[PDB]
Design a binder for this molecule. Structure first.
Ligand SMILES: Cc1cn([C@H]2CCCN([C@H](CC(C)(C)C)c3ccc(C(=O)O)c(Oc4cccc(Br)c4)c3)C2)c(=O)[nH]c1=O
Ligand SMILES: Cc1cn([C@H]2CCCN([C@H](CC(C)(C)C)c3ccc(C(=O)O)c(Oc4cccc(Br)c4)c3)C2)c(=O)[nH]c1=O
Lengths: 193, 189
């Protein structure tokens, strides 16, 4: 079993990449792909509160962490117990970069919150779709651009402090190459375990 | 302004105490009575999830999220107006109930709630210290009795500066008087 998360800003091609990589991995592994809330009823009700939110950033961060726990308990943990490879589109690192860094709560504060939610369940491997701010901008106002750059800056601060868990993939390449590198990184990891 | 929370297990006379203290303090102060979620839309929606539908950590994070919304949208605006806010249950209830009695761990729940309150600790906290036996009589099953006892043990650990322990085994008239005198001494100094 392996718990692999996918991370990146908007414009990294993350969702297109995970979809392709998953389609290729299904041919050789017992794998599922999910994201939060991912159909878990409580997480879906929490999602509705977030979308209906000038919500206080700490309340928003707690709602993401509550959804994360419900999705972890109902979907992720049972699949890992059945020996599956679990691919998850966004996890703890999205809260660290968005709520912690870009919104300014602080990465360390948001990490403490998320550690309460995940109760030790860190990913075995996190693929970071490393898109430059400029390529990201072109794939997508001043406020939206400032936020996008701050999300990228946050991910770089997180990856600098936890190098071993992450595998950075060049997301500035054509999408076919991003898919290939991510798939190869994953199979290299899965064949070692 | 003053932020005063009230804590205690069921059967501590907490409802009677807050209402009677409110009625006496309104003569001299701009006072409000509140409890979470306290009518804050988001908090009320979180409460519906809790009541109409759970993993204990998800539950703890929902109480904390409702706590933050009630603090930001109701408590802080009242404190800014110069109000005395009488709040029925706060951080200490999550520590005693989720942390201790439900078994998540007091330290884990404390960290969660410090994220939620971001330094906004009560100015004063009245703990209505009732014995399990007097509390049980005021309430009126084995699992419920043991849970009530665990809640009390949870509060004992928390209490072990803002805390003012009032002897809630006394008749309620005396519990009210002691609580009111404790609050006046705080407000007037
Ligand atoms: C997992 C995670 C993600 N993200 C970002 C990633 C980029 C998109 N954004 C938006 C947020 C916005 C406030 C509605 C604008 C956004 C966009 C679409 C949706 C949807 O599912 O339709 C959405 O809802 C969700 C998603 C996941 C959990 C819950 Br609960 C609610 C939020 C959320 C964080 O910031 N932190 C995190 O931990
Ligand atoms: C502030 C706080 C309280 N409590 C306890 C105190 C004793 C009562 N219990 C129950 C819980 C139960 C699971 C439904 C049995 C209970 C009973 C009635 C209600 C209702 O308001 O109708 C209720 O809903 C709420 C209350 C507050 C916030 C949100 Br959100 C939902 C929960 C909650 C904790 O445990 N931690 C805390 O931080």
């Amino acid at each position: 079993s392996a718990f692999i998360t996918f991370e990146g800003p908007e414009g990294s091609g993350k969702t297109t990449v995970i979809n392709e990589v998953y389609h290729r991995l299904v041919k050789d592994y017992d794998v599922i792909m999910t994201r939060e809330p991912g159909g878990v009823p409580t997480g879906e009700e929490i999602r509705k509160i977030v979308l209906e939110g000038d919500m206080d950033i700490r309340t928003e961060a707690m709602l993401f962490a509550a959804s994360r726990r419900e999705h972890l308990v109902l979907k992720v943990i049972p699949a890992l117990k059945e020996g599956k490879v679990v691919l998850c589109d966004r996890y703890i690192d999205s809260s660290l970069a968005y709520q912690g860094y870009a919104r300014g709560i602080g990465v360390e504060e948001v990490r403490a919150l998320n550690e309460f939610a995940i109760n030790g369940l860190y990913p075995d491997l996190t693929i970071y779709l490393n898109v430059s701010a400029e390529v990201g901008r072109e794939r997508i106002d001043q406020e939206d651009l400032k936020f996008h750059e701050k999300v990228i800056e946050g991910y770089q601060e997180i990856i600098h402090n936890e190098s071993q868990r992450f595998k950075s993939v060049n997301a500035d390449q054509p999408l076919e190459n991003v898919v290939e590198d991510t798939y190869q990184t994953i199979i290299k990891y899965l064949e070692k375990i």
